[model samples]
Structures are given as structure tokens and as C-alpha cells.
Target chain A: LTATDLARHRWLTDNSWTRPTWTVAELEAAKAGRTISVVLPALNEEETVGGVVETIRPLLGGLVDELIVLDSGSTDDTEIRAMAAGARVISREVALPEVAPQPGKGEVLWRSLAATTGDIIVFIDSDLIDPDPMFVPKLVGPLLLSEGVHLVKGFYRRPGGRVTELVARPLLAALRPELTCVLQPLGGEYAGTRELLMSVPFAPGYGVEIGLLVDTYDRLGLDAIAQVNLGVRAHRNRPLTDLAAMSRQVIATLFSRCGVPDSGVGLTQFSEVSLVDRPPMNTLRG
Target chain B: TDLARHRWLTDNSWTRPTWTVAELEAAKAGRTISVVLPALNEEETVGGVVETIRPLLGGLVDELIVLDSGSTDDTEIRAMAAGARVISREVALPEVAPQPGKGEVLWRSLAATTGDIIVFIDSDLIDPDPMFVPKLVGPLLLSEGVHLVKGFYRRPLGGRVTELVARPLLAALRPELTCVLQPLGGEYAGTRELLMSVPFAPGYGVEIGLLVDTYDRLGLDAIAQVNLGVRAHRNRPLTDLAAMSRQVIATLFSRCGVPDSGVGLTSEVSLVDRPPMNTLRGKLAAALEH
Candidate 1:
């Protein structure tokens, strides 16, 4: 599709209130046979993990069969804290033997896919300060109704560090023009089928989200992915340097998957001119 | 000998002589001077910053550039309205996709701007002294050898992390920069030529990176740290401070080639290979079906 066509079909809207309402009876009926797991990936996140586990467990108690907190060797009281909050904790390194654990959010997420036996898996970052009970309902509601919708991504009003909004967004817009529609595509909160998530390769850094979005689209087409609004999610804002690395990882994952050659340094692929009209539109014109 | 010459030049030429608004204006007749506020979502304080710095450095600075790292707020608008050239970090250097850090912005700011002298100020400064710009620029403007003059604050505001973690780290790593009270201080001014020549670390370690890199390339005498009294900002908590410490330590260690024992510190600085936006589903399907 042309840039103009894609611009016209931009999907910027508030889908929080318009979330598909599944009654307790309907959820129970759906849950009768299907196993669902809520995975919370953490690293030294003792403060916020407890609240997140507690909120999600009761809200999804009937619908979700299990809640797993995949700890990436937290030096803090993350394991004890999460357990106290009633989440079954598992070490990330033990879960995935093939992939060595790296210091990243992606490590826990990748392992969670392998460890959890749920037909549907939801991954929530442990850093969130206030996780609403509605997070699971809003995320899972769309997947229940839609067929072949493998990924349910969350878009929320996140008060990002000044660097992310000003520096990261505009850059992403110019380079990955296709991703401008994904409000919080890099956002850690998302849900998908275990069947879909395990097939994708996870990058070690912040590129995990972008890699997931790209992999999902390449495998299941555009219609299979949906973005749900989760209201305001407050987390720590990274410095300009961390944001830069994150942006690099995101762009790197996207470009590499698209078969774009990496130039080592910070050169983006958008400037490389690819001919729109192939097979020499007119022999005389050339 | 070069350091002594630079000091002598500054003392005789511009250090002893303070310029009035008229003198400063005439001094910068056609010289291109740019101020880059390498910012991210700084809508809260950027307006005041632009206003405070603009008129103070009036005729001295030709262009006030806000090289932003994608702020979701109206920081760009505020900066633009306050009479600064607002360029996104990505827009400036489209080839190298912007990384999340101040050092990256500083590195790219050199490529984005055409100024002979580039001054960078943090966007979150609440009460900026009007003379902060001239103090930083005065050294570079007078002497040719003095490539960078970093701002050194007396009362370092905000987090205790800088005092406890960064300062001690700097003392141990490179002692020549120990004279630099605030080595990791974000706000500073320097020459465009010097900035372009230096390799920037795109993370919390940027301030130190600039100091160390500049010192290594230019020597101890080439760099000067001017005293900027009592800079203030919001204090970061211990939890957040730890992360900042990690980035800073990582940057320092990377620059010094120090190994991170926790993870094998082999510098496998490979070019990042980005996947297309649709790889998640394909991989997921393959994993599930298989």
C-alpha cells in the first residue's frame, strides 16, 4: 500500500471502553477446557511485582489456570515478594537451557513461552507501579472472539521520558514508517497464544517488542494482531543513552528481519532508494 | 607547553576581558554559534530554559537547536515557540537510528548543527544562571587549543548517585579528570570540531565519556571545567539510581575495556540486525505448530 493509503487507515483510537465484554459465564465456558497462563517477568522488581500479581490473580482467577513469575535472577526480594503476592515463581535460566540468560526483559519472556503450558499466554512487565485489574480483561477479551488473532498488544498513555517521545518516535516514524501506527509497540505489556509466541526468535535487548510485532505480522498477517488500550501505565523513564540503545535494538530487529543489510554504525535503511515500478516501466524512459 | 599556551591565550585575550551585550554582539558578527538542548519529554521545564538562555546568549549564539530524542509531550512545540531550531534526533542523523542516551544526541548534534561552537544544556534546569552560557563559551571563544570547557557545579543537586557512585568511579578510573568536580554533569559547552572528532557513548556514561575521550585525544590541558554554582533538578530514587549506575559503569567499563564479570565482557560489537515488523507471528506459529 502507498504511504498515503496507510496514513488514511491509521488506527489511533481509544479501544479501552469498547473492549469486548465477556461475562463470567462466557469466560468460564471458554476456560472449561482451555489452559491459560499469566506470566510476569521480573528482575529486582520487588516493589511493583506483588501488586501486579495480586491484582491479576483474583481478576483472572477463574479464567486463567496459572500465574507464573519468571524471575531473571533478581538480586532483590522479587521471588519472595511475588510468591507472597500469590504467583508461582520460576527461574528464567532453568526454563530455557538452549538460550543463555541475558540481562534483559526478553530473557524472562522467551523462557516463559517455553515453561508455560497455557494455550494462551499473557506477559506483563514487573516494573509497572499501578497495574489495573482490567489489564487482563481488556487484553484477553479480543483474543476470545477473534479467530487467528495470535497477538493482543496493549497501547496505553505512558508518560515516557522526554527522550523517548521527542527522539525515539520521530526517528522511528522516518525509518520504520509502517510502525508509526503502533502507539506503544515497544510497550512490554502484551498477550498472545503459546502456539504463536514460541515460533519467533527473541532478541537479547529492547528489540524484543519490535521483533515480536514483525514476526507476528510476517507469520499471521496484519489482521491477526490487535492493540488494546490499558489506560495510564507508569514505569521508570530511561536516560537518553538507554533509550538510544533501545531504539537501536528496535530498528535493528525490524531492519534485519526485513532483510536490510546492517552498516555497523547508526545508518538507517530508509534512505536507500528501492524502485516502485519494477521490470523497467518504459524501456525508453531508462 | 600547549596547555600553558592555551591558558596564557585565554587569560590575556578573553578571560580577563568581560564583554557587554554590545561587545558580545559585535564579537559574534557572522560566527555561527548553536545551542543544542538534547532533550526528551522536557515539556515541563524546556520553555523556561529556552527563554532564559536565548536572550542571554542573544547575538553570541546564532542558532538555538533542540535536538530532541522523541518527546511524547509538547517539548518540541515549547522549544520551537521559544525560538530554537527543533530537530528530532532521528531527523538529524537518519542513517544511524537514534539510541536512547545523551551521548548519542551530543554525538549526532555535531552532525546536525553547523555552528563553530556548540553548547548543550539539560532541559530540566529549573533556575539556570543567565551567565551559564558565556562562562562555558568564553574559554573556547578566546583560545584555539582549548577544545572543551565543561561546567563544574559547586552544589550538585538531584541524586546522590553522582556524588557516591560516579565521582568515586571517576577518581579511580582516570585521575586527570578528578579535577572535574562533576565529571558526569550533563550540561556543558564545547567546539563543534572537537565534538565531531570524539566517539560518543550513547548512555548515562556520556558526560564522563566526553571528558575521558576528549582528555585522551586532546590531553588534560586541552579540557577545562568551569564552576557553575549549585545546579538543581529532581532527585532520583535509589532504585532508579541503580540502573543509572549500571549504564554509567557499563559505559565506563566499555571505554576502559574493563570486563563485566557477571556477563563475559567480550566486545562483540556486531551490527544490529533488525527483523521486519511481522516476524513475531511467523516465529510464534512455527514454535507452536512444531
Candidate 2:
């Protein structure tokens, strides 16, 4: 069969299986001998981290092997709050000292691989406010049921933001239109084998999600991926100035992958190149 | 007595030009003023922003340059129809490859047009009064030492953790800029000479870097903030805000001679392991060495 035919056939087979309706008994059965690790990498997310941890922990208790909160120096109560709700909190810097830390969502994912040891690692952002309980089961089920699949990504019915619906969707439609099948390719929720993720190099910023999809397809083939429709996950929208930086980073990753030379792309420039300020330890002693 | 009188006159006249509309018309030097809207996929609001600002200051501002950063939406079409010199960001700065950023576009706007004074307005602004241009430029035309006049808005600030956290921290660290409200407001008008001298911060912290650099090099008095009533845009989530705060603080601290914190607490600060990329072919290495 042609690539398109195979893709269509796979979609049909995947879509035919109605999301398994897991009762309390079925859920317990699925939890019997399985170990699931949910890793949430956070930077100052005190508002939503506690709820996210508390909500998922009860539902996935026996099922969830580990709940790790990888913090990137949140001065807020994000660490304490997450820890209170039964999460194993660790600083991102502690796991990977060899690679210098850049501030990005992708960096968290890369570091979390080393910190987490579940058979299946489920990643979720701490900012998600109203994520349904089914989010974990729905994302992880495909990978659990099928041996061939390496990754399971979430798709939501409601739009993430106006920009995602209006801007990112149309852009993705035009650029990598093929991947439109995987709704919310940029959605920050997914479950994957720890082994598959460790081998793929993570893009440090906005490019992480798209880079993951592309890298996965190249290495593992398109058939080994499934998308779960999670009803809606509420989150905050980014300001234009911040969005501009994100869009740049995301596009930079895409363009870099597409062989677009950094030079000749208009409006793309290195903004600030100065080293970050760190007071010496000796100064504190004095 | 003659030398003192001359000095007073020079200071007075340079600080406040006495030219009216009639005098400006009579001089009729016809200098071109280009307002570059460096945008990407800003279809929702770029039209209104360009149209309102263009007609109000059209006669004085000769060109409206919209340097698109590969917008998939109708941002380019809207910009052109609304009367702008729309060019791809890549077209203008062939030497320095465009990165996806506002500062990059602002930097490239220098090479793209021949304007004596360049005004940059955020395209996402709703209810932008036409008077914004005149207000930004008025200070520059009137003053001798003033190189940049930033557009300060009356809107309640949201979406940034730095505005809440880092700004206060920096103010405590460097109390000289305590009086300045909205130190990181993105909108501003400046002479080409000043912009060319200052390096652009490509990512989220560009505005802070601009304010700090201008203050450090030109002194606080040279940078003026004009209150533009109530500019509005989306509010970022706390998580995103934290990330922005980190970048903004990192940039500001670096400029203020703060030592590197070694590594950030969040993600790996390692050099991106993805494909090798360069903004300016030989310029990257040359820039680093320098």
C-alpha cells in the first residue's frame, strides 16, 4: 500500500476503537502489574500544580508508579505545594549537569527522561487548570494496548487559544499539512516509552513539540503514533510580546529543519546575547 | 556675556524646536519617515493598526514599512492594502539572516528603509489613537540629547512575572531608574543613529535590554516615556510568565554586571543539539570573537 493508504488504514483502525470506557474494576485491572510515571516540569506554577497532582494521583494511584515534579528553580510555592500533594520533586539541574540548562519546555522533557523510571512516561504541563481525569488513561491507553506504538499524544475538542485555532492551525495546514491528522500537535500532553524519547534530541524551546513529531515519524514511522481526544484543557493565553518570541522560536526550529538558512529570513535576529547575572558565592560570605 | 548667551540659546532651541505646521511646510525638505511593522501572522489586528496610524501622520511619515517574518495569514496582504511598504524580513537584511523576532525586524528595518526617524508600533494594539506617532516623534524633534521616546501606556499591566517581580528587584539593585514606569514597554520612536549603536535582544527580553542599554550609555534623561492611554493585548499564563521573567531577568542582570547563575533550575541550558544554524554566515563567528 501507498503511504497515504497506509495512513488512512491506520487512522481507520485507530479511530474504530472507541476510547475504552474504563469502569472502576477495569481501571483496577489495567493497574494490576503496570507502572506509570507522570512527570510535570514546572517553572513557578504554584497556582495549578497542586490541583494537577492531587487530581491525577487518586485516579491513577495503584496505576501510577511514580509522580515526579521536575522544578526549574521556581521561587514560588510550586515546589512545596506539589510536594504536599504527594509528588516526588527534584530540580532539573540535579539530573543533567553535563548539558548546560537553557530555559525551555523541551529542556524539561529531556531532563525528565533521566529523572523518571516508569515503563511508560506520561508528560503533562503544570498550567493545565481543568484537565479531565480521563486525560492520563486516554493518552496512555494506546501505548499500553499496542506493542508497536511508541507515543500517544492528546487532542482536545476546544481550542487551546485563539492563536492556535486561527494562526498555528492554518500555518500547519500549509506547511506540514500531513500532520493535521494529529490535532494539537503543539498540545503539551503526551505519553511515550522512555526509551524512544531518550534517543530523540529535544528542541530547547517552541520547536520541541513539532520537532518531536517530525523526529518520531522519521525514526519510528507514522504508524507507531496515536492521538486521543481529551475534551478540553483550560490554560492561559500568552501576551503578544511573549507570543512573538515563542512564534520565533517555533518557526526557527521548523525553518532550521527545513534547511532554511538563518540568514535571509526577515525579522529574525539574535535579540540579547549577554551572559546571565550570577553573584559569586564568595560575595555571600563577605 | 556673549558666550553664555549663545550657550543658553543653543540649549533652548535644541530642546524645543519652534517650527509650526506652516514652518514645516515652508521648509518642505520632504524627508521620508518610515514606520516598519515587523509582524508574523498578525491578521486579526495589523490592518486597523496600520490604517489608523498611516492617515493621521501620512503627510509627515512618508513610508509605512511592514517587514513580514514569513506570516502564513493575510498579514502581508492586509498591511499592503492598508498602505504600507510591505517586504519580507529576509528581503531587507540579506547580510543578517532574519530570526523569528520583533527585535530582528526592528534591527533589519534599519537596512530596509531610508527614514530619518523610525517608529515601531505593536500590530496587535486595539484602539490605537492616531496621535501615538506625533507624541513619540515630538520629543525627538524638540530635544537635543533625547535619542529615544518610548510609548508608555495607561493600561493595567498583566501577563509578565518580571513586571511584577524582576522590575522591582532591578529597581532595588539599580535605584537610578525607579521613576521610570514600564521600563520594558515595546513601542518606541528613535533616531536611526541611536538604534544602530544599540544591539537588539532577539528573544523575550529585548525591551528591558533596550531600556537598560539606553540608560547606561545615554543616561536616564535621554530616554523619555510618553503616556499612550490604554494599550491592550492577551495576558500570558503564570507558567509562561515565569519563563518570560527568567529571560528578562537574565538579560537585565547580565547587563548590570551580575555573574552567571551557572545553570537555570528549569531546563538544560545546553547549546541546542539540533541542526547547526547561523544568523549571519561569517558574522556569527566574527561577532563572538569581537
Candidate 3:
């Protein structure tokens, strides 16, 4: 980040950025007809994606257009169910047929460049039960409203890992000093221009969100970055046991950006079951 | 909680009504006890095993019997020097033809020993304890309704077979018996009646065979595991460890794969729900089948 960028730091943050009906009305007209694509990256979302799609499908083809549900592998009916909710569905294998594929949400988001043909792309999570329609207009409206802004991030925190908090926040703190202003580095919900999205190489898995934030801040300057408060996102919970596996992908991605080569040194794991904290629980009985 | 009754807790691990000199002297009138060391060619370690146990063998322990399986070394000399009456496997059952394996030596020791309670200690221990004599004999001797006892310890020299082989097998086959730390540790004791009835597997397969068989025969509360402090003995290399694991894993599968006398499922748990092996095999077979 430059000193001029640091001097005008207040210009970068929008802590209270929210949707007003007037802005939404202007956004419908301010489109002046440039296309907007909304991508919902989904996996095993049978119970929830229909609600998300139905809530936002009405705002399609006006200011909001091209709804793509990019799905990673799900053993359940996530793909079929999402297609029923009126989405142009794309699977991981089907996209970029020549590239021998990789795992992680970042891979899905990166390959989405081939499938989409819109001016603006807004990524949304498919797991929301009460999906807000205003999120689409408000997230994209900044690029049309403000001349300079290029990429926008939604704000929230993913809540675990020592290596992530230890290695993750501290790396972004020193290296990409501008990215420290933006939280929720791993949240799948974010939006960017076709220029900014196509220019950067996507990192694997959980690393996608943070990797883009760094690449964008370094290349286009921090002013291109914008974050809107989509307050208190409640999706679903995985088993707490999987935190280690998640952090391995996170650390692997971060290290890939640095000069660290994959040494293939992995962790040895053991069995542990933790009880509730502060006043640590004692005996368990029938 | 009346901690005195909860015998598995670390503090309660010390044998109660406290089996000291007075209790041993006073109770010599009642139950007779024997200590049997099942040995092979363990000349280097057998002396320490007998001497550590020799002092408590007067009026307290009625006899100290060493059931030496075919030893090429001077394990008998050391055992006799340290005061245990050594009986060779061939001599212990001269009438019965001499069989091979450690379990063969142990079963023959049953005929040789004349105690109501018998404690089996492996002769190859680098460090043996005098406290092992009283603490092991204590539960069956002191507590009522106790048929068998299992010994466990902070194994200083770690055994991988316990974690990789024994634990996973026990957790699947008999979740109740999974509590034993070193489920296959060499040092454990039981009543003469219980020992006689339960069949022993040949060689290293004997530990799980004894543990699971006794646990199914006797109830859960009838068992107790004591914390014998840090034991630094032998560590096996990968090649020998592989052979050892093969036997233990096969023993566990061969024994547990077929449901034993009440080792399978209680009537409360549905039999279909109870067979984890069946569900596991069905999944494996289906994966191959389709």
C-alpha cells in the first residue's frame, strides 16, 4: 500500500454500507444496461438453495442477470435441486475440460471465468435459508455508483485454527498491509469486475478469498477494494473435528504465494474430544 | 461420590483395606496365593523379575512358581537364585506331551501352581516391582464379587501394537473392554477358577484372547485395571513389529469376527444394529459388488 493510499484510508472502508430503496431504484436504471452475473457456489445444498434461488430469481434479467450455480462434488441432489430453482448449473469436471482439475472453492470460482459472459460477477453462498435480494444490487451498485472501485468483499469471520489466525492474519498484516483493513478473508461471498477476476490466478480451496484480496490489493491498489457489511451471516456448521483439515488447505495456499515449495511434510493427528470451556466440564454420566 | 468404591480412579488404584504386612499375615489363614513367572530364554532380565518379587513370598504368598518354557539360556539359574522354584515346561507336565508357545507354558503352570489366586508376570521385564505382588492379589483377595483383574501401566518403552492393533479392534468388537490401556500387556492376574475356564491363544495372541474371553464370561464390573507405574523394557523394530501385528490382528479378527458366548449383542440392542462387522462388510462387499 502507498503512503497516499494510507492517507486516504477512510475512503477505502464502508462499515455502514447498506441498501437504500433509492439506490436500488437508481441501480436498476444506472445499469444503463451492463450485464450482472450472480454465482452461487454450492455443495450438498438440497435443503437450502431453493430458498436462496427463489428469493433472488425475481430480480433477474433487469439490473441483475445470468445466475450461475457452480457446484463442487455433492453425493446428494445439490445439482439437480439447484437446476430446478432456475440456474445455469456447471459442475467442477465439466468446466475447463483440458485442465486436470484441483480441489477447493477457489478452483470453482476461477474456472467460472470460462462459463460466464457478464460484465460484473457477484459470488454468493448457496446455503442461505432466508436469502436477501438486496445483497445483489448493493454489492454491485458500488462499481456503477463510484467510478474507481473494482472489487467488493462481504464482511464476516470464519471462526477457527491456530495456523490460520497465526499464519493467516499475520502474513496479510506484514505483506499485503492494505488487506488487513478487510476481514473475513475466507468467506465465499464476494464480487469483482471481469477485468479484476480474469487478471489474477486463483489459489486452491479455502485460500481463494484471501488470495484474491492480496492479488487485487497489490495489482490495482487498495482503492479498488471495497467491503460491505452483510451483518452476521449464519450458514451451516460442519463437525468441529474437521478444522485441522481445513487449515491445512488454508496454510498450503498461503505458502504457495510465498516462495515456499510443497515439501510434503504433513501433520500426525491423534484423537481428542473437548468439552465446554471457561468452567471445564467434569464427569459424563448416563 | 464415594471415591473408595470407584477403584479405577488413579488415587483409588492403591489396593484397599490396604494389603500391607498385617493383612497378609492375618489373611494367610484364609485364601492361598501363588505368583507364576512364565519364561523363555530371558537370562538377562529374569533375575531382576524374581528378586523384586522374592521378599514378599514367605507366609504371604504360599508359593513362587516359575513355569519356564524351553530356555536355551540360564533363566532358571537366575530364577532359582532369586528364590522362585523353577519348573521347566517339559517337567511341569511330564505326563502331558510338551507343546510349543508361551500359552502352552502358562496353561501347564496352572497344574503346577496350587493357589486359589494366581498372578502371571512375564519373565522378560527389565524392571519388576514388589508392589505388583500385593496390588494384583488385592482386588480378588480383598473385594467381593471380583472374578478377574487386568493390569495396565504408563509404558515408558511404548508399544505401537497396543494403539494400532489392539485398541481399534477392541473399540469395534467389544466397546466395553476398550478401557484397558495396554490391553495386551504381559503383566495381569486372575482367579484360578476363571483362568482354568478361559481358553488361551498361542504366543502373543494370548492377551486379547484372555481379555475378551474373560470379559464376555464375567461381567464388566467384575474386572478392574490397575495403574502399574512407568515400565521401560523392550521396543521391537519394524520387521519383527510387522510379524507381531499380523498375529494380533488375525487373532482379533478370527476371535471377534465370529460372535462369542454373549460377546456379540445384548437383547436391548437390535442384532441388525449390533453387528458393526456385518455393516462394515456389507459396505465393503457392496463397494466391490456394484
Candidate 4:
């Protein structure tokens, strides 16, 4: 191991980025008199969408402005189930019609914001089983209270540390030192300001989470970003081959965002997708 | 260059300025002059227009601003590349709210600019001349009692609107502005004090409305006409010309303190254009790690 990795190994001793614990009331008190939105970019999560929506639905209106579900060509009853559970759902193509259609998880997340009007947007995964509302408070607290915090990616106590430790952590330590403390830089549950999100163009693949982290640090610096501990994040797993496909996109996006040239190792057979979202219809008012 | 008489206007028009840039620069003195261009989807022409005046970008002109009203094309990028500092309309006067109209951009331009003398040039000129800086804005500096200098050009200026819509309306209401040629042309300069004192038409009627409104408030002598030579532009289609005439007539009718001008946006379509996250695996597998 390199000397840099050894120092990082001592620092990665634990989830040092997160504090002792946090509360939603503290988040409510710290919120800067602005609107908040909870967004979910879902696909084939009929079993989990409703439960996740139900868990977050009561936090709707007022400080939490709206809950949106962006269904990305789901073959199942994900859209119908999501709306039934109080999500103002829209299909992927309808969000931004100006550009051509872009698919994959990044495509929906990138296009979903044009339909929202909130000072703070909290993005959550749709496939969470019996998810806690604490997810919102923990992800958004640092953004509300901290001096320079602009982005907060969620971290958790779970069985998912392999890809993070083996791939992301060392790569980030070597290349992007600012984001080194972020335990789960690849974690999906994250929140940021409207200005924070719009200023950076998105990476068009599974690489969106790290893209936002690296891009946010580039724009706002390490002092303006943090990671939130959302207790434990456990979910169903994908096949090993599928996980490999995701890692390929994730690493590719990292190198691309950091202006790193190809290492002559990437596979030529590739998949490309785009996102096209239009403006919101202004369905609600303050 | 002598503005003492109208005999010269009737005799030898389109004559080159006897005065040079040095004289015009002197006339500007310590007072700042700002130039504004409100562009929308003019990617084909905005860059060429901005670069032509790069020499006058520093002290001669405090700023050359291009305020855009949401162009999906590369209008803002090209404008910035050519030289001028560009900003979206929504970004300009955010407190006032944003709507889609050329006048909305101009009205917001007031808040975005800082100049004792503000000159607004239309962005869609086919053949923009660098000399227009002095020719169009010269009389504003040298001539006394000129708070506004309306640029008069010699060429295919207007279509059916001049005869059918604008001329008839001017003869009927504000008859004193009848001699001002090309009243609808966007090439004009004004004192910030006068431009701010009155209301701006929130549509295509902004040009004529300013002339007529200035006539009533600041008197006809407060305005001067300059020969900026021929301004040849893309010949707009008849359908688009009708839309311009409608907006112009609507502003004229509305200004007369008439209730509910037949042409209202209430009857028109209101189009409003209203931007990530996480995860791993089955949940966010398609999305990479954050």
C-alpha cells in the first residue's frame, strides 16, 4: 500500500464524518425558512415504493413542500403504487421534454429537479423497506445548521462496504482528497440546495452520487460539505455481474469528472442514455 | 454633423460624420455610457454583433450587456465568447419575476445596467457596423436638450405595419411623433433619468411608446434623430409581422388609458419553463456511489 493509503487507513478507522446522533426537530429548527422537497427516482419497486412513500408521506406540505416519484420506464405497478401513497409522480420522459430521453438512475435524478421548487431537495431511494423518516432529518440537518455546508450525502451502518473500501475510498483518497472523509460517497440518500444542484451538469450514469460529491466539493469546497449517519441502510442485493456493470460506470464517471484520461482498460461495448425534462406546471402555491 | 437645422436632414442625408471618435469620446467625458443588447434565440447573429464593438468595450463603454430570455440554443455561450457579459432574463431582475417578451428583458435591463447614458441596440442585425457607436449615439452627447436619440435608418425598414398599424395610430393619438422615422426600430439611446421616469411597454410596443411618452413628458426637443445609415435585417414573415403590430397597437390602446385592450396576454398562451442523488445496487445500482 502507498503511504497515502496507510494514513487514510488510520482515518477510515470508523464513520468519523458522522457525529454522535441527530434529530428531525433539530433539523426543523435549523432549516433556513425555506421550502424542502423529497424526491425518489424509482424503477420496478412496486413492493417498496408504496412503503417508502407511506413512510415519508406525512412529512409532506409546509416545511416539506412535496413528494415526487419519477418512474423510469418501470414495467410493474411502481408508478400506480407510488401515487397511491401520496407521491406526485411523473414518468421520466415528461419531466424534461426539451432534450432527448436519457435512461438509467442518473437520468431520472438529473431530470427530476426541473419539476420541483424548493430551497432544499432531499433525494431518497424508492426501494427502501420500512424506511425511517429519520433519513430526511439526518441527510438534511448539516445543510440546515452547519456554517458552510452545502451538500450532505447519507451514510449508514450496513453490510455494504466492499465496493466503497476496495474501489471508491482509495480512488478518492488519491485523486479527490476533499471527499476522503465521506464514508459512503456512493450513497444514494443525499440533499442539497437548488443553486447547488443547478450549477453543476450531471454525470449521465450510475456514477451520479460520486459525481455530485466530487462536483460539490469542487464548487463549494470541503468546508461546505458533509456526510450524515442514517442509522443502517439495508436493502435487497443485485447479481454480481450487474454490480460489476455499475462499478464500471461509476469509475468511468469519476475519471471523466476529474479530467483523467482513459487507462486503456475500459470495455468498448457500452451503454449510453439521456434525460429530457420540462418545467413544472406550478400546481401549488405558498 | 451640425444639428442646428432640419435643412441638412432634407438635403444631404446619410452623410458620414464630420466628427471622429475622438470628438465623440470627448463629448462622453467623465460621464459613463453603457450599451445593452436584449437577445433571444439570435445565436446566428449575437456573436458577430458583439465582436464588432470590442474596441469600445473598456472605458468608452462602461459595460456591454446581453440579457437573454431563455434560449435553448447556444445564444448566451456565443455572446459571452464574442465579448459581452451575458445573463439570463430570470437572473437579471429576479425580484420582479420573469416572463417571455423583448420588453421584459429591456425593462429588466434597467436594473442590470449602470450608465448615465444607456444605449439599447437590437440583437438581430444582419450587417452590424462598428461606426454605429458614434453615428447613432453622437447627437446624444453633443446636442443640448436631447435626453433621447432615436436612430433613423434608410432602407427596407418596415413591412405593412408602418402604413397599416403604427402610422395610423400615431396620426390619431400622438401626432407630434409623426416625423420620427423608424419609431419601431430597436436602435435607440436614452438618458437613464428619462428612461426610468416612465413605464416601459412589456411587449413589442416599447419603441413607439417611449417616443410618444417622451413627447408628452419631456417635450419633442428632448429627443433627437440620428442617421445610422441603412440597417438591413432579416425580413420577418408576415405572420410574425402581424404579431408585432398587434403588440404595438395593444400598447398604444392601453396607454390611452383604455380599459381592456383587445390584445391581452390573458388570451394568449403562458409558457413557463421551470434541475441529483445516490446509491448502490438493486436500489440505486444504475446510479453509482455518491
Query: TM-scores of the models, in the given order?
Result: 0.50, 0.49, 0.46, 0.44
Task: State the TM-score for model 3.
Answer: 0.46
Candidate 4 stretches with Cα past 4 Å from truth are: A1-22, A263-286, B1-290
Q: What lDDT tens digits, residue by residue, belong to model 4 across residues A7-99?
A: 455544432345525666666666658778888989899999999888787767644778999888899999999978889998766877766
How good is chain A of candidate 3, measured by TM-score?
0.81
Residue by residue across A245-279, what tens digits does model 1's lDDT show? Answer: 45445445555565543333331110111111111
- Candidate by candidate, in order, the iRMS in Å equals 17.6, 18.4, 22.6, 32.6
How well does candidate 1 match the true structure in TM-score terms? Answer: 0.50
- Model 1: TM-score for chain B: 0.78
* Model 3, span A3-98: residue lDDT tens: 434533665444225332335668878877678888888778889877777766877877777888888777788888778988888886675665
Weakest ten-residue segment in model 4 chain B by summed lDDT: B272-281
Candidate with the greatest TM-score versus the true structure: 1
Q: Candidate 2 has what TM-score? A: 0.49
Q: Which lDDT values do the candidates have, in the order given?
A: 0.63, 0.62, 0.63, 0.67
Off by over 4 Å in 3: A1-286, B1-18, B24-29, B155-158, B257-290
**lDDT for residue A231 in candidate 2, whole number 0-100:** 72
Candidate 2: DockQ? 0.02
DockQ each candidate and list the results. Answer: 0.01, 0.02, 0.02, 0.00
Kindly report which residue stretches of model 2 are placed more than 4 angstroms away from their true locations once superposed. Answer: A1-34, A59-61, A97-100, A263-286, B1-290
Per-residue C-alpha lDDT of model 1 across residues B242-271, encoded as one tens digit per residue: 455555655665556644322101011211
Give per-residue lDDT, candidate 2, residue A263.
Answer: 27
